[PDB]
Design an enzyme around this catalytic site. Structure first.
Site, short mmCIF file in Angstrom:
data_model
loop_
_atom_site.label_atom_id
_atom_site.label_comp_id
_atom_site.label_asym_id
_atom_site.label_seq_id
_atom_site.Cartn_x
_atom_site.Cartn_y
_atom_site.Cartn_z
N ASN A 54 59.62 19.18 16.80
CA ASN A 54 58.21 19.28 17.24
C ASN A 54 57.88 20.61 17.90
O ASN A 54 56.83 20.72 18.53
CB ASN A 54 57.85 18.15 18.20
CG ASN A 54 58.13 16.77 17.66
OD1 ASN A 54 58.79 15.94 18.31
ND2 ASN A 54 57.67 16.50 16.44
N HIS A 96 59.28 21.99 20.48
CA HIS A 96 59.46 21.94 21.92
C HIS A 96 60.91 22.31 22.23
O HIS A 96 61.80 22.03 21.42
CB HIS A 96 59.15 20.53 22.47
CG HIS A 96 57.68 20.25 22.52
ND1 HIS A 96 56.89 20.72 23.55
CD2 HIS A 96 56.88 19.65 21.60
CE1 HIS A 96 55.65 20.38 23.25
NE2 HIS A 96 55.59 19.74 22.09
N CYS A 148 59.64 24.06 29.60
CA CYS A 148 59.63 25.49 29.36
C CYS A 148 59.02 25.61 27.95
O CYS A 148 59.45 24.93 27.01
CB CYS A 148 61.05 26.05 29.41
SG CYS A 148 61.21 27.74 28.77
#
Ligand code: A1BM4
Ligand code: A1BM4
Lengths: 264, 265
Positions: free
Chosen positions: A186, A188, A223
């Site tokens: 995704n 991330h 992050c």
């Protein structure tokens, strides 16, 4: 891998790979964390998930890690078979917990154990919120009803409050940035990358003479793909360290943690 | 995994893992390269090695990669089983070659192929050398005698000369540094990390709309654990080609040069 006889836990065997080992010819803590994540994903898939439940998909809700705690007694060597058993449990309205037991497939002996706390979050606004009645009901049919804990001990290491490191840090590694291999499907940053970043500020001499026995990590903020991180460490003591990951720029905290290392 | 019936090649099956896939839910090129390395290591182990031969350990010699060439037709999806066959061949006194064929375990069709050139280097001085007769004899008993090539074609892209990128680069990713997960068991940067670093300078829009079909990489110099690298890319071209350069951030010392070919999704 497969669900156990009662269908309330999941087991999988892994053969440790050449690129998965460190200087001791044994699996790194990042390889262990990747194996925990893989067995966790295979468990969710085997019980009907496409991590999210049907009600979570309608309300745009996801599970996010709040805490990860790992204790390793023996790291498996290159070529060894490690068996990992995982199960999940509801913790009322606070969230969910996922536990693991690591075993040497040959001896059947416990070589490691892990526990993690997960909280509910709206994927768009990033707002926490507590667990609703509808979600707990469709989760309890896949969880043991009686408590089953990888860390049962009353007042144990996995539930300890972690303080914020005070500047100046004893050690630091600055300008850490994720690459495409550090991202999940995704886009991330993968949770295992933060473990690696925390460990980057431990000096090479500690790594050369010690083995990591325990790691406890709190996740405060994610992050982003274009964020830059500073990794900070101070000796608090066997050797113990206090850790802090923060954004290079404004100093925004992303994680805090503790590690305990045993002399080789 | 196991050696095939004639004992001249090795096969292994891999189930693609959740953390091994990208945005398409299919294995990244770095996962593919890690799988090639793993099957290559298991092959060396199965035939008596630990890939230093008996004479190589006496003379402080190691095999180092000079070139890696990978072509992927279909990336395996998360949960899929991929079968990889690997073999080695001697190339006279220049060095050795290791080839691979990737197949979908279910359909049996070829989904990728790879080839790599290896040269002998003294571990201490870092000086490259030709292959001696004694070393050539010790590993020929594990190689097919007739040529067996993953890229047999007369004008294959696996043996093309790669030019040096001229400044200014169209794209760049600066200050790339290896972490402990990027190091192998001997504390040297893993060869797969350089592939990732090369790809870091490709823009995200190309990655989002294209799939990497071919990657050719030349290894000129090793990146140390405390080195910092700059990744440079320029478009050279329904298909997109790029020329790549990895160099040390400081003095601009070249570590790698390469080419990638991408097809529109
Ligand atoms: C689909 C699903 C359920 S649990 C999961 N991931 C984990 O459990 C990991 C997270 C961090 O790395 C260690 C364990 N993914
Ligand atoms: C024991 C031995 C000999 S060569 C080897 N590994 C490879 O072949 C890898 C190198 C990195 O790129 C992918 C292939 N292992």
């Amino acid at each position: 891998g497969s669900l156990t006889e009662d269908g309330l836990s999941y087991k999988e065997k892994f053969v440790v790979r050449s690129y998965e080992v460190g200087s001791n010819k044994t699996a790194t803590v990042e390889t262990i964390a990747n194996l925990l994540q893989e067995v966790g994903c295979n468990h969710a898939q085997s019980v009907g998930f496409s991590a999210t439940t049907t009600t979570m998909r309608k309300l745009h809700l996801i599970w996010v890690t709040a805490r990860m705690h790992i204790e390793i007694y023996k790291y498996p060597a290159w070529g060894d078979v490690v068996e990992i058993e995982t199960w999940c449990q509801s913790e009322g309205r606070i969230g969910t917990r996922r536990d693991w037991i690591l075993k040497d497939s040959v001896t059947g002996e416990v070589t490691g154990r892990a526990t993690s706390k997960w909280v509910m979050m709206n994927q768009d606004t990033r707002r926490l919120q507590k667990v609703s009645d509808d979600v707990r009901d469709e989760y309890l049919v896949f969880c043991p009803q009686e408590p089953r804990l990888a860390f049962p001990e009353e007042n144990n290491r996995s539930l300890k409050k972690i303080p914020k490191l005070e500047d100046p840090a004893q050690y630091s590694m600055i300008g850490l940035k994720p690459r495409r291999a550090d991202l999940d499907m995704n886009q991330h940053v993968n949770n295992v990358t933060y473990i690696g970043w925390v460990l980057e500020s431990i000096p090479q001499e500690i790594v050369d003479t010690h083995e990591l026995q325990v790691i406890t990590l709190d996740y405060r903020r994610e992050c982003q793909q274009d964020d830059v991180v500073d990794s900070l460490t101070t000796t608090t003591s066997d050797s113990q360290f206090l850790h802090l990951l923060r954004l290079s720029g404004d100093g925004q905290e992303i994680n805090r943690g503790t590690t305990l290392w045993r002399k080789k």
